[PDB]
Amino acid sequence: GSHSMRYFFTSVSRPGRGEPRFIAVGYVDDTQFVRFDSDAASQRMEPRAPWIEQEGPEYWDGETRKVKAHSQTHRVDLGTLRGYYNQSEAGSHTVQRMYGCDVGSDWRFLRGYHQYAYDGKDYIALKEDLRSWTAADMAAQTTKHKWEAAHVAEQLRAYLEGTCVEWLRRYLENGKETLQRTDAPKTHMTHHAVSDHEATLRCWALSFYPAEITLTWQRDGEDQTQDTELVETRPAGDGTFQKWAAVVVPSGQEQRYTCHVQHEGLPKPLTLRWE
């Protein structure tokens, strides 16, 4: 089906405690594949996925060069924004930037992204047309006008429609065993005595990839959304994800409840019952 490529960048100022902290990571779908951390010893872009570890020295030296350039525009950015907001030199501030692309099931270009946030709120974003900008703040307008005059969007559209999509599907065929895989959830239920008249039924989905999944409970085939405790899909640490959904069942009513699991790794969706 569809695929995406994304780069996330975070810079945090450390007033007095040295130069700003910069962290960069890249993902293809739910799999991280590269990182750069400013405080790390190597000062190089590093592999984080087995399939990218065999790219050449040209790749690694070129990406190290470009990621460090990104580090430095962000450290100028920290000053610029402190200026736009007439803020003190004493406080720590965060700039975040994300850009990347999506391809459809035919693997053709579908969406492109380029956006910034300052201290955790939207600052400026390239719109879907990849010809205009959304700036909310009055300070953000300097940036909007600047980038308009300088034709920033034209450079960005060019990359997002060309290079981004091109290397995404290079990564897709070069990492096909990982990226074109699908691990189906291993499911089970647990039953715990809450009291003399109630018990929790928890439905588990473990070891699945990709992270998207729908896990729901029903009582006689109807909605139980307000009545289900559902946790956030979490990483197991080995590249798969986990999730659970729980309902408190009145004693003697276990047979009324069903757990439903939808995941693209399943040949058909599961309906599970405690019995």
């Binding site: 780069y7 990406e63 470009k66 990621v67 350039a69 525009t73 950015d77 850009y99 290079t163």
Partner: peptide, 9 residues
């Protein structure tokens, strides 16, 4: 592969 042109706010 990263974008290669500097952008400054």
């Amino acid at each position: 592969l990263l974008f290669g042109y500097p952008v400054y706010v």
